[PDB]
Each structure stands twice: as C-alpha cells, then as structure tokens.
Amino acid sequence: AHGPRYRVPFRRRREGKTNYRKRLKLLKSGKPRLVVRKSLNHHIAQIIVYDPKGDRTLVSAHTRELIRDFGWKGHCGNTPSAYLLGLLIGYKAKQAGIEEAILDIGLHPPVRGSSVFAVLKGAVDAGLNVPHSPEIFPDEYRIRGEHIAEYAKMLKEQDEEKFRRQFGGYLVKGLDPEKLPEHFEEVKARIIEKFE
C-alpha cells in the first residue's frame, strides 16, 4: 500500500489460498465440507465444519499414510493414489458418523477426469453421500491406472534410457511400472477388508 485509500486484500487472498466468493456459497449450505487439495507429490482430503471463530476439522486423511499402514509404493500424485485416499477418507467419515458432505476443490478448476474428482469417486464408492453427477468422474481404466502402464510399455518399446528417466524412482523402489494396476487392486482390497 502507498496511500490511506489503498485497500489491502485479506491475508489468505494475498497468499492466493482462498476464494471467498465460492467459500460463502459453500458455507450457505450449512453442511460439512469435504475439502480436497492437491500437491506435486501428495494429496490431502479433510472434512471440516464451520465455526464463526474458526473452522474445525473432524477427520483428516493424507497420502503419506498410504505408503505406510496399508502399503502403497506408487507415486502419491496420481489418479490411483487419489482414488485410494478418497476411499480411506470416506471410510473414516463413515466411522466418525458423518455420511453426507459437500465437495470443496478450492481454487482448482472443474476439469473432467481430474484427481479431485477421482477422490470424489473414491469417497462415493466408500459410501459418503456427496452430491455429484457421474459424467464428471474419470474413466474406469484411468481410475484403475492402465494409462500409466501403457505409457511405460510405450517407453520400453521406444528408447530405454527415456523410460528409465521417466520411471527412475520405481526402479530403485523395487516396483516395475507395469503391474501397477495389480498393485492398486491389492491395496484397494486391503483397505476394504480393513474397514469392513
């Protein structure tokens, strides 16, 4: 600011973290908010309720707990990880006693087939009553994770050094990029059996 008439935006608006116009519309419902947030290497899902003096989180889930606990050695910034996290948070909400929520994707755009909508699909499959329309979900093959395996196979067919550059972390970790759908199915079965 350089003058008395300058209008300094809210702290969160300056930090570029909140869209208050959408936040007001979300809060007008008066229902728990299923907040989904994305990062380069992780995903975050929380369920929050409103307090006039500060929001309170009831149940929170992360992807860092998927590597441990159930066991998920894949990259935590992709659609299968998002789906697993959605299942986990949905089951946690059912355990906590909340069955319906309202999705909150923050500043992310509403693009079809995104990881946020993968999380929404995972929560719905878990059992949470989150309003939605099926047309927005990612395709079943992408949800399972085939596209990654197809890309890995294409890279292997093409120059192998490029394939190693693309999937270097999986090689050192000990997982072949192919069979990742099988790994994801095993993880999903583990989670379902644990929570049922």
Partner RNA sequence: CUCAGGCGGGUCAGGAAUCCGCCGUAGAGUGCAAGGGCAAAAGCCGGCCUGACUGGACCCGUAACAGAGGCGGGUCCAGC
Partner RNA sequence: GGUACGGCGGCCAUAGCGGGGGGGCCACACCCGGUCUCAUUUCGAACCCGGAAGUUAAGCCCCCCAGCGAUCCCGGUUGUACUGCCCUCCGAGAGGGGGCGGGAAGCCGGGGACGCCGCCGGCCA
Which spans of this chain sit near other proteins (rule: CB under 8 A)?
4-9, 15-17, 20-21, 23-24, 27-28, 50, 52, 107-108
Smallest separation (angstroms) from other proteins to the CB of 6 = 7
Q: Which of residues 118-137 bind RNA (CB under 7 A)?
A: none
Q: Which residues contact 73 (CB under 8 A, 6 or more apart)?
A: 67, 173, 174, 175, 183
Smallest gap from Cβ 128 to other proteins, in A, equals: 24
Which residues, including other chains, have CB under 8 Å from residue 115's CB and lie 6 or more apart? 38, 43, 77, 78, 79, 82
Q: Check binding of 194 to RNA (CB under 7 A).
A: no
Q: Which is nearer to other proteins, 14 or 68 (CB)?
A: 14
Minimum CB distance to other proteins, residue 190 (Å): 33
- Radius of gyration over every alpha carbon of the chain, rounded to an integer in angstroms: 19
Task: Return the residue of 31, 62, 94, 156 that touches RNA, per CB under 7 A.
Answer: 62
23 binds RNA (CB under 7 A): yes
Q: CB of 193: closest distance to RNA in angstroms?
A: 20
Which of the 8 DSSP states describes residue 57? E
Stretch that binds RNA, among 77-85, 95-103, 122-130, 181-189 (CB under 7 A): 77-85
Judged by beta carbon distances under 5 to 8 A according to partner kind, the member of RNA, other proteins, none in contact with residue 181 is none
Choosing from 31, 108, 132, 190, the residue that interacts with RNA (CB under 7 A) is 108
Beta bridge partners of 60: 46
CB of 106 to other proteins, least distance (A): 8
3-class DSSP string for 73-132 = CCCCCCHHHHHHHHHHHHHHHHHHCCCECEEECCCCCCCCCCHHHHHHHHHHHHCCECCC
Q: Indicate whether 169 belongs to the interface with RNA (CB under 7 A).
A: yes
Q: State the binding partner of 135 from RNA, other proteins, none, CB within 5 to 8 A by kind.
A: none
**What strands lie across the sheet with 102-104, from one edge to the other?**
56-62, 43-49, 33-38, 102-104
Residue 29 CA to residue 159 CA, distance in Å, equals 53
170 binding RNA? (CB under 7 A) = yes
